[PDB]
Each structure stands twice: as structure tokens, then as C-alpha cells.
Amino acid sequence: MDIAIHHPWIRRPFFPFHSPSRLFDQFFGEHLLESDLFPTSTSLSPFYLRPPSFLRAPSWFDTGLSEMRLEKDRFSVNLDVKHFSPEELKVKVLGDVIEVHGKHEERQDEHGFISREFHRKYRIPADVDPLTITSSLSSDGVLTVNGPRKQVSGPERTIPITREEKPAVTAAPKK
């Protein structure tokens, strides 16, 4: 009418992941047993981008933003893994530690199996609280922990009386 267009993204949802048949079978319809599969084809009707790993594909590192992102609701820390898929990735938050474990099978042979691991590890009690810091991976393995650097705020941090103790709990503030 007035005339406008974007198009360069249109390649994406044909092959967002590897385009397995079991892929669009998870995201087409509804979980009943008569529901068929509509699983991938140059007949499907859309190709659609709405599943998790597919929006995080153009994000890729997911901005990769590692700091500043400070004091607010949305302190953020970027746990890099340089190249791994989500499943070889494995995040854990535990009191004063945030860690990512990555473990891939690089190459397989004879009776030999060649594992690579990435273990990016922290200890940051003043900065991380498992009650409110929250951990998000990108499809390349990069994990960002985000959120308020403050609910509990003690050493372990775990002095978590936050609902009713407020003076001492916040005497360690957004620091």
C-alpha cells in the first residue's frame, strides 16, 4: 500500500537446526495420538521459527554481554563456552558458586573415545544468589547468568531471612 519489506531472515526456519523430521513433529500441532507429525517438507506451508534454540540461533552468543549489567535488577555475568551444543552443556548454581560444565564426544574410533570438556567455574558470593540469579544458554554454549545481585546478601550467601529480617540482610546491599 505504502510499500515496505524485510526478507533476508526467510532462509532460517527451513534449516534453523539440522531440520530433522522429529524436529517440527515437536512444534506443529497437539500431543494426541491421531495428530500425525507435519515434520519437514517443501509442502509444510509455513516454515516457522518459534521453537527455543531457533530464536537463540541469530542471538548466537546471545550478545555475549559479560558485565555492567551491574547494581540493578539485572546484574549479568557471561560464562563462555567457545563452541558446544546445548546438550554437551550443563549449568549449575549452588550458593556462592556458579559453574558451567561442558562435555562433548569429539571423535570416536576402534575402542577409543575422545572427550573434550569446558569447565568455566566461579566463586562470587557477594555477586551471585541462587535465589535470584538465573542462568541462560545460547546455542553455541555461551551461558549468561542474570538478575538482581541481591536478595539474601550474606557470606554463603545463605542467611536467607529476607521476608522478615531486612536491616542485616540489606546491610550487605547491591554491592
* Cα distance between residue 37 and residue 28, in whole Å: 7
Put the strands of the sheet holding 143-148 in their side by side order.
Answer: 73-79, 143-148, 134-137
- Return the residue of 33, 71, 149, 174 that touches a copy of itself, per CB under 8 A: 33
Residue 108 lies near a copy of itself (rule: CB under 8 A): no
- Return the residue of 60, 71, 137, 149 that touches a copy of itself, per CB under 8 A: 137
- Return the residue of 60, 71, 75, 131 that touches a copy of itself, per CB under 8 A: 131
Residue 75 lies near a copy of itself (rule: CB under 8 A): no
- Return the residue of 60, 71, 75, 111 that touches a copy of itself, per CB under 8 A: 111
Residue 64 lies near a copy of itself (rule: CB under 8 A): no
Q: Count other Cβ atoms within 10 Å, centred on residue 41.
A: 11
Q: How many CA atoms lie within 13 A of 101 on its CB side?
A: 6
Residue numbers 144-163 binding a copy of itself by CB under 8 A = 144, 146-147, 151-152, 154-163
CA 139 to mean position of chain CA atoms:
8
Residue 138 grid cell: 545460547
Q: Which residues are annotated as a binding site?
A: 83, 104, 106, 111, 119
